[PDB]
Amino acid sequence: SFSGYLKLTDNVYIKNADIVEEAKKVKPTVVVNAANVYLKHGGGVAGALNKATNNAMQVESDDYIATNGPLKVGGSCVLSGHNLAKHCLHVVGPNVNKGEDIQLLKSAYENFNQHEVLLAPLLSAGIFGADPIHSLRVCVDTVRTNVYLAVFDKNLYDKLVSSFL
Ligand SMILES: Cc1cccc(C(=O)NCC(=O)O)c1
């Protein structure tokens, strides 16, 4: 199971780790992907998770979009976790770099409440442009299920822990 996590609250845990490496080690029931509405897994967490599946996540995602159309910003879909997890919960946080409403970050985190335990990144953080400190705050105040957050960047991880209220 999950190891080396710092407990932030009753249900939120955090670790400085590569979420792909964490997923391959733990093989969690759910790994969260930092998805976009098109499920185009190009960069950041999505690109890394997809590359770890040898592009199987993208092929499956393209079939999902062909059938269902794009997701909503703040929405999610459950697809296969491939070699990383039982399932992948593709969650679309607002992309501040595309001018999307940061208020949708709480709706995006609400998707985590449908799963008892998840391995996840900070939504809308990184290349999505939102403040990761704010993302962690929204996570703690929204997610009630057990969430194990993997923060890739060491300097950000240190700042997140040291500033956590
Ligand atoms: C280097 C940098 C700048 C701004 C934001 C971030 C960030 O939220 N990263 C997420 C993560 O490392 O898991 C990193």
DSSP notation for 106-127 = HHHHHGGGGSSEEEEPPTT-GG
Closest atom of ligand 1 to 121 CA is 13
Residue of the CA atom closest to atom 7 of ligand 1: 126
Look at residues 101, 89, 94 and name the one whose alpha carbon lies nearest to residue 145: 89
Closest atom of ligand 1 to 151 CA is 13
Domain extent for 98: 1-165
Residue of the CA atom closest to atom 5 of ligand 1: 126
- Residue 102 in tokens: 């940061």
- Residue 148 in tokens: 């194990």
Return d(Cα 159, Cα 153) in angstroms, integer: 10
Closest atom of ligand 1 to 150 CA is 13
Alpha carbon distances (Å) from 118 to 68, 70, 103, 126, 146: 24, 23, 22, 19, 6
Structural domain count, the chain: 1
> What experiment produced this structure?
X-ray
Count of CB atoms situated within 10 Å of the CB of 54: 11
